[PDB]
Design a protein around this ligand. Structure first.
Ligand SMILES: CS[C@H]1O[C@H]([C@H](N)[C@@H](C)O)[C@H](O)[C@H](O)[C@H]1O
Lengths: 346, 349
């Protein structure tokens, strides 16, 4: 069965990681405990790519590409490749891992997105050639998890589109991640070391700020990240009375739709947090530390906040806004007690 | 009488600069020739603030805060002020320039945005207390330009919103920019220098890439900036059949609204391009190089691309889309002929 994740690129990496005997969810993502509030907002003029104040959450920390590489000793590097050389690079990558292949949503018929290339590009994992000569594409997104066959012709049609709004033209992420059999024996040892290192970064609770052409990017780590996030998201309660009207302007229905999109993107991050925290718990139990840390369930607290984000996205009103904030405050407080307990035991 | 520009913060800065004998449109913005395409796109994972691929244009280059500080010997300083120090900051800043005071759209009643704090915060220039106790606020955006009165009570309440989605509570940009007597006379000298420095940067035509938590940010300077923009903007032609197709789900309808927003944002940057270009013309004259560039009107070319964008909001079809594309290639063409002549004429001395 095909592995999946709330972020489809992580699902893809998980399938690839399994080929080389690496458990991404448990040993890589689960080994990296993180909690960060991120804000894009007005800073120093000019910032022409700053289209709106924007807030979200991330439990990805450094991210799986940096951690998958670190821990396997291998390599997760991105690159554009010319159409003549694409079919071969796929077979070449599969030997030592695999490829994340970027295409538009309209290039994947199962996505049902013919009339639009999507807000962001999509990603699939090519899994070798079937008897027919048609390629096997692994879909990493939980909503469409599985295997889809696509003719070879369509694969270069999909990977080199015209026009190319997403600059997706033959873009590939190359996972060269096969651990040497000595490194492979060190995986749980290294996972336990990454586990402690992320917990220390979490409790260090550092703050940061950068000025970019897309705006000022603010971030805050650690136990205060979710209380700071909730405080900031209150600023969007104006969406509730606006969305309860049926006679919205064109300009006003745009406000609502971007605010709603802000809450969809956050909901996917809460799903990811629940997925990561489960991986951490499986890593903890496999390390034999579960009985020492206790029965706290940060993965469950984040799942409830995910569901509550879904509920807000479907019906953007004040009761569901307030219920999201309260589910997030609960996840913040189970997180910090679990983090402190787990670092103590390590 | 109130100055204005298509970006509200630029119109606000023009008003503060006039108070200290500096013509922002001519000596600061007109003295910074620039052309740049910006893309935000997928880069290294993870990038949680990367919500969509996005492309836009900028003729602002380094931007007026850097230029206006350099040229005046002063500073353009951002700061959050506690409530009990806002009025005194407003009064104290006015002697050396003034203040861009940040505000939610709903704080400014003339914006008719009571329902929303806006996608972005707004800025106004407080302009003293009137003999009746009321405060005067200068609106620097062309569509609302003028002076509005606010009571001190409403100004304080509006400058400290709770909650504060935009993070603008007591946030001020302090423009301490009064030139010394000697600097005031060297002004048009420095405006001449900045014009050449900016022209040389435009032809250096460098590009860059940064990886941020908001995505990979790609930029390109030079004569290739507008053809590159038109190439990438072709990627959004899918918006035409998508709009007016009446079986639209919440997600595909969100795609249409964000596409239209992309071109609304772009339209403002073309109107700024026409505004900056025109400022470069008026600077080229008091400098006396008008005759030695010919009759090339980059302001007029860019103003035709601006109008071409506004057509797109009312009707978003392949024709108006291609009309905007052709208008943009014209302005890019005019821009490189004009810049090549003016940089040669500048150093001909
Ligand atoms: C409900 S599909 C959701 O994600 C899409 C795609 N799967 C990603 C991976 O590119 C597109 O960005 C869509 O515009 C967005 O609404």
């Amino acid at each position: 069965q095909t592995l999946h994740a709330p972020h489809c690129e992580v699902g893809c990496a998980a399938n690839v990681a399994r080929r080389v005997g690496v458990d991404l969810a448990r040993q890589v993502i689960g080994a990296h405990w993180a909690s960060r509030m991120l804000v894009r907002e007005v800073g120093t003029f000019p910032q022409p790519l700053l289209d709106r104040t924007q807030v979200t959450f991330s439990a990805q920390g450094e991210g799986w590409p940096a951690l998958l590489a670190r821990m396997t000793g291998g390599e997760v590097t991105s690159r554009h490749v010319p159409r003549e050389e694409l079919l071969s690079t796929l077979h070449a990558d599969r030997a030592e891992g695999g490829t994340l292949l970027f295409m538009e949503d309209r290039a994947c018929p199962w996505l049902d997105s013919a009339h639009s290339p999507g807000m962001l590009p999509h990603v699939v994992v090519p899994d070798g050639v079937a008897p027919d000569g048609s390629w096997q594409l692994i879909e990493g997104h939980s909503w469409w998890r599985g295997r889809y066959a696509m003719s070879e012709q369509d694969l270069l049609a999909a990977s080199y589109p015209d026009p190319d709004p997403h600059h997706v033209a033959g873009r590939v992420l190359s996972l060269r991640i096969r651990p040497s059999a000595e490194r492979a024996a060190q995986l749980d040892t290294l996972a336990r070391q990454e586990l402690a290192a992320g917990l220390r970064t979490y409790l260090a609770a550092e703050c940061g700020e950068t000025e970019t052409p897309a705006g000022r990017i603010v971030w805050a780590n650690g136990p205060q990240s979710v209380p700071l996030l909730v405080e900031r998201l209150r600023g969007w309660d104006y969406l509730c009375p606006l969305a309860a009207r049926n006679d919205l302007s064109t300009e006003h229905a745009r406000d609502v739709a971007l605010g709603r999109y802000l809450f969809l993107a956050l909901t996917d991050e809460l799903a990811f947090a629940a997925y990561a925290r489960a991986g951490t718990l499986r890593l903890v139990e496999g390390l034999g530390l579960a009985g020492a840390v206790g029965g706290l369930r940060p993965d469950e607290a984040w799942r409830l906040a995910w569901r509550s984000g879904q509920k807000l996205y479907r019906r953007l009103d004040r009761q569901n806004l307030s219920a999201l904030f309260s589910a997030l405050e609960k996840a913040a407080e189970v997180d910090v007690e679990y983090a402190r307990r787990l670092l103590k035991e390590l």
